[PDB]
Structure formats: C-alpha cells, structure tokens
Amino acid sequence: ARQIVLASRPVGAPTAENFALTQSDIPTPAQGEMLLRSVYLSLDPYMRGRMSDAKSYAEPVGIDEVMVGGTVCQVEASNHAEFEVGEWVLAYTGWQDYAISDGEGLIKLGKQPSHPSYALGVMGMPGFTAYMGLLDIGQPKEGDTLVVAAATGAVGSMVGQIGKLKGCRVIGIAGGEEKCQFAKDTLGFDECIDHKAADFAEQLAKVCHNGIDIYFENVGGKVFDAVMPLLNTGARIPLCGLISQYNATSLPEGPDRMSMLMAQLLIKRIKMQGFIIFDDYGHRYGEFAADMTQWLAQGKIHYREHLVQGLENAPDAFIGLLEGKNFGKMVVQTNQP
Ligand SMILES: NC(=O)C1=CN([C@@H]2O[C@H](COP(=O)(O)OP(=O)(O)OC[C@H]3O[C@@H](n4cnc5c(N)ncnc54)[C@H](OP(=O)(O)O)[C@@H]3O)[C@@H](O)[C@H]2O)C=CC1
C-alpha cells in the first residue's frame, strides 16, 4: 500500500510539506481478519485538528503515521468473519491503499452497490451529522428561520434541505456568488448570503427580518458575530463545527466576550449544544438511513460530490477543502474497482 503520512504538524494553514507519500509492504491478512483495498477516501475538516497535538476529543495523528479518515473499500482477502471477497464496506482505513480489518465495518455489498461513495456523504457521516444536529438539537418547527453557513458543503447542504422539507425558511451563508446561487437554484435555499461580501452582516440582517430561530453553527468567527444580534428568543444553536478557527494561531484581541455570550444565552433563553456524531448514536442511525433514503428517492435531497482523482492528490485537495476550494463533499478516488 501507498500511504499519506503526517510529516510535521502544521503552523496556521497546512502546507504540502506537512504530508509525505510512502510505500509500505501491505500483506498479512491473517485468519480471523481481512484485507481491505480502498476505492474512495473522504476528506473532512476535522482532520485539520488531528494534525495538531492540542488536547482534543481524540488522539492526534502521530508523526509519520497514516492520516486518518473514513473510506469505502472492497474486501480482497478471504475474511474468516462474515464478509466475502467482493463485499463493499464503509471502513476507516485512512489515506492508504490497503488495511487489515475485523469489525466494525458496514456492508454495502456488493460487489454491485449503486452509489457506494455516497456512504461517505449524504448516506454517511456528514448527512447523519446534519440530520441529528438539526432534528434532535435544533428541533425545527414550522415557520422557524434556519441559518447555516458552509451552505453548499457536506453538512450544510443537508441541514438546509432537511430544514426546507421540515417547513423552515432557510437562509444560507456561503463563500462567493457561485455557491450562493447554487444554494438557491439547486439546493432550494430561500436565500444565501456571501460571507466574503464587504457588507455581509448588513445583508444577513436584511434578509433575516424576522430574526433567527435556529443557527446550525459550522464556522464561528465573523459569521457567528454577524448572527448573534439576529438571534431570537428561544433560539437553538446546534454546535457542529468552527472551521474559521481551525487554522488559528491565537485568540482574537479586544475585551473578553465570554461572559457577553453567556449573558446573551441567558437573556434570549438560547440552547447552545455541541455534539460529535462519532459518539454512540447507533439507536438513531437506522431512522436516519430510512428517512434519508426516502428523501433522496422523493427528490427532496440533492447531493453534490466533489470527486478528485489520485490519492497522491489527497493532501492538496484537503488544503483546498479548508479554504472553500471544494464544491460539495470532497472525496478522493484512490483506486479503480
Ligand atoms: N460535529 C461533528 O461531529 C461534525 C462536525 N463537522 C463540522 O462541520 C463543518 C463542515 O463540515 P463539511 O460540510 O464536511 O465541510 P465542507 O464540506 O462544508 O467544506 C468546508 C467548508 O467550510 C467553509 N469555510 C472554510 N473556512 C471558512 C471561513 N473562514 N469562513 C466561512 N466559511 C468557511 C467553506 O465553504 P465556503 O466556500 O461557503 O466558505 C468550505 O467549503 C466543519 O466545521 C466540520 O468540522 C463535520 C462533520 C461532523
């Protein structure tokens, strides 16, 4: 197997120097285990945090160890378990060609699943994140105003479309005119505001004439600063991500606003709740899968995928992913099936 290992921990934004490409002898499938060969590899913003050694919900990637991530693989070794040579499976083998496994995969067998790569997006972790965060924490009611940034991304597009079918007025936030116009034309968003526009806060306040009832937080920073004075009484904030600060080297200057945010949550009676989808939500995944399969069949969910070819290109893609260079859920094709 070839491999993308972490050469050095990045300073600010990650560079191509922080990664390295290396071959390794990948055999020993053994008895009781299996050898998986990857076809697709997901790239996700959380991986940035895994490059830094700051105290976090998970262990950082060790120097010269494989970079982590969910993959869609095929079995190529006779598993002694209940999986055959050919069964497609959603695994977590990282940025490499081969790995050895023995639970807990998810059979998409195979070897003829319809859209196996969808297991990394709309039917996988990002769609599940959007589903759970919006429905269980945001708890949308008819007439609620829903605002989400990174609106054409893996999680944001799903948040917006689910909110639309749940009776929300959905205000998107994205970077650049093309993404906002795609969010309106194809994803069904009522509005979509360019956060790169100089008068972004004023545009947001203008289209949010009735306030914000749910803010699905994906970005933080300037976007949340513009959102705060528009929050309604009883608003809900599913705290999903804060990508605007993933490359931050220090805290912003100026006076400490922590007590200010706490006073706002108190005065406006707001629920702000962080969540990590990788926690045990096994009791909800079946409901999510049934609902999302139905909504996809009904034509209420458009899933945009950004497929880039070549595992050797996986670093650069990831870097671009952090700057909004992606259009949709970023996936790298590592091998032909
Ligand atoms: N809590 C959980 O368990 C999970 C959390 N997440 C979080 O959800 C968020 C998005 O996930 P995903 O949809 O996969 O990523 P995307 O597929 O949305 O791509 C990331 C997007 O972030 C946006 N972005 C990056 N920097 C900035 C910035 N400084 N200001 C505004 N927007 C920015 C860009 O969209 P644009 O071009 O519009 O700026 C970029 O395309 C991330 O924060 C991620 O960490 C993801 C999965 C699960």
Side-chain angles (χ1 to χ4, degrees), residues 1-24 27-30 32-77 81 83-86 88-100 103 105-107 110 113-335 337:
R2 332 160 272 166
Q3 284 160 323
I4 306 287
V5 303
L6 178 61
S8 61
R9 313 214 179 261
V11 278
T15 68
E17 145 178 13
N18 303 129
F19 300 99
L21 296 70
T22 193
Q23 274 229 9
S24 176
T28 167
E33 319 176 327
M34 78 204 82
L35 173 97
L36 309 180
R37 173 180 173 269
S38 76
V39 186
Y40 300 114
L41 159 68
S42 173
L43 301 188
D44 307 87
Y46 78 82
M47 298 174 178
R48 173 62 181 86
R50 304 287 258 270
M51 302 174 67
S52 147
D53 60 3
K55 190 197 264 165
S56 190
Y57 67 92
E59 298 296 329
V61 168
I63 297 301
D64 299 323
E65 310 187 19
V66 284
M67 281 287 293
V68 288
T71 51
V72 166
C73 306
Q74 333 192 22
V75 187
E76 251 196 1
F83 313 120
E84 295 168 28
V85 191
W88 289 68
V89 63
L90 168 66
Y92 202 82
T93 67
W95 310 23
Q96 56 177 337
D97 288 320
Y98 296 93
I100 314 171
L106 253 68
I107 308 184
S114 152
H115 299 92
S117 71
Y118 282 16
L120 296 173
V122 61
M123 291 297 302
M125 187 268 292
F128 191 30
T129 296
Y131 182 94
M132 198 232 91
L134 176 60
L135 300 183
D136 290 3
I137 302 184
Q139 300 184 22
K141 304 307 201 300
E142 143 83 10
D144 274 345
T145 301
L146 166 65
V147 176
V148 58
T152 68
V155 179
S157 64
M158 300 304 138
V159 174
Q161 290 177 103
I162 296 173
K164 203 81 202 84
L165 66 88
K166 290 296 177 182
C168 294
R169 175 161 186 254
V170 181
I171 310 289
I173 301 177
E177 281 195 358
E178 195 182 2
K179 287 195 174 183
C180 298
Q181 208 67 33
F182 180 81
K184 274 183 286 186
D185 294 350
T186 299
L187 306 174
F189 282 53
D190 293 301
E191 307 288 343
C192 200
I193 304 307
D194 194 346
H195 64 68
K196 300 177 181 180
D199 59 343
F200 150 69
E202 287 77 18
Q203 293 188 238
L204 184 61
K206 189 55 180 300
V207 299
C208 295
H209 46 92
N210 273 332
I212 304 178
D213 302 303
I214 306 170
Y215 174 57
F216 196 98
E217 173 64 283
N218 280 329
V219 169
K222 163 186 63 169
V223 170
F224 184 62
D225 288 341
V227 159
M228 276 197 64
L230 306 169
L231 294 163
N232 280 334
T233 292
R236 286 84 67 203
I237 303 181
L239 177 48
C240 182
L242 303 164
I243 190 172
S244 74
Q245 74 191 57
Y246 289 178
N247 290 336
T249 48
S250 64
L251 284 175
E253 297 297 322
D256 191 5
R257 296 189 298 154
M258 195 184 81
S259 62
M260 192 270 302
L261 166 66
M262 296 186 67
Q264 285 308 298
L265 298 179
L266 171 58
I267 282 172
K268 287 183 178 178
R269 300 138 260 192
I270 296 184
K271 178 177 72 182
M272 176 178 277
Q273 174 174 357
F275 69 100
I276 298 196
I277 200 71
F278 278 138
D279 284 0
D280 175 65
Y281 298 107
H283 53 297
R284 316 279 292 102
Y285 171 79
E287 319 180 59
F288 154 74
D291 268 358
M292 182 62 78
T293 298
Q294 278 283 339
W295 296 335
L296 269 170
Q298 294 167 28
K300 296 177 174 178
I301 301 282
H302 188 289
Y303 176 52
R304 175 154 197 164
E305 191 192 62
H306 190 142
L307 176 66
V308 279
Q309 294 291 329
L311 157 66
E312 67 273 9
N313 303 108
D316 294 326
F318 174 68
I319 303 185
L321 163 70
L322 294 181
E323 310 307 318
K325 307 290 189 54
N326 61 308
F327 213 162
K329 196 265 162 298
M330 174 70 71
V331 193
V332 279
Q333 178 150 24
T334 70
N335 288 300

